[PDB]
Amino acid sequence: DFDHVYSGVVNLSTENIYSFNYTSQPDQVTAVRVYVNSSSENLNYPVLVVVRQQKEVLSWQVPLLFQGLYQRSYNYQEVSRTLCPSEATNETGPLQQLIFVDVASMAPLGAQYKLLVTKLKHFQLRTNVAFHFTASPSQPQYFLYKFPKDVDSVIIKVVSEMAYPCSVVSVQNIMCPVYDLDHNVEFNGVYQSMTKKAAITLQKKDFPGEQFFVVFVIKPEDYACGGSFFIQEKENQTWNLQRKKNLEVTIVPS
């Protein structure tokens, strides 16, 4: 059941399996959202969490580890990701899709974890309607925009209040898996880094499906955006664990 937070313990011998079932009616897209965290401060035994779809498998390790420049390590405890939104057409049918969440680890004593699942109520961006959302290095986001019939070009405008952390806004076509990671978001489509403002101009003629994904991914450090670095004698920067950035996104017709 969505909108519920399960709590559990993991260890070498026991793994937890939760099967979710849901339907997506035609002309409406429903993106699933997974909200995991683990309280294990240790890094030699991170808890692995996998989400399996009908076609795609996505796995990650918690607490997520980042290796910035100058060999500083970062340990993030809250991780989150959005799955491939299965698309339905005028070929109707209540597609009774299923999604597995499997958690396991090999910690000698174990590790705590809390897991929440929820469909994104606002997944399809609307024209000229400003939306507010909070991102984070380990909590990337993305939403689907569908072009209108009359409009032939759009400008997507993103505004933030606090300049740091550095962030990246990308636009890709609809062919999942969706590239929403710091080391991979740059491979495909358009993208740009930003602190306060960003704007991408898109034409429907370059997108055969007349609908595209917009992905927001926050960097772990701020070197690429000209930021500074707090020199700390501790390699594991436990202070950099709650990085967040408020964001407003609006798509205006060109």
Added chain:
Amino acid sequence: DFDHVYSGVVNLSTENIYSFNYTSQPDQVTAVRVYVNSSSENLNYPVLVVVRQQKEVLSWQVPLLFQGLYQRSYNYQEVSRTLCPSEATNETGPLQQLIFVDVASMAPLGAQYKLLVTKLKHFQLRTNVAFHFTASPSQPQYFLYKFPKDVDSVIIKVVSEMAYPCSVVSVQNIMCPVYDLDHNVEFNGVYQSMTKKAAITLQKKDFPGEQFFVVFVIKPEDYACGGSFFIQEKENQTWNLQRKKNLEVTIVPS
């Protein structure tokens, strides 16, 4: 047990689990190699294969699907990958490491799969000793090179016979996971595309661990290397299923 090919059937209700255990003595690196293939020609239900380590989880889908330019799809049946090589130091101990291989799917009838596991006998490249190996878009490779005490710079030279397919040779530091995919290999470290020849100059001063990984990844198409494209009316190019490239690698002291 390594050097053995297991055969099995997968479906919605049944999954297969095989736990492997092995040890890596200090000053010797042992990289595990996973050799999977599936005979399911269908693409709406690919079989998912995951490999779980003590810290890292790596998952892929078979038959692997590639989306080149001009919306041509490719279906590769043989997939393979090398895991994170756990490193042991003068702090001795026969590290009795374990690695899980879990296979599952939801095909309405099922899908065949054959799985083989083996340690790489030649994983640490030797100076001035030429090595021969066969790569492929879905079968990437990588090996570890360790700098000598006297030598301070090296040149790695790669030579192939057949110009196509296009390939990429990358060098990264030792901090796994190792970036050995077409959309990600370009993120970190040095790399270059090639058809027949390539050469990377490296200094030990830029590598704190005085040892680096060398990754060979073959592209699915040849557009980036100036190759042509066989125009076919079939979107699923079943002919492009056995792409291979013989390769010779030699590290000379600068």
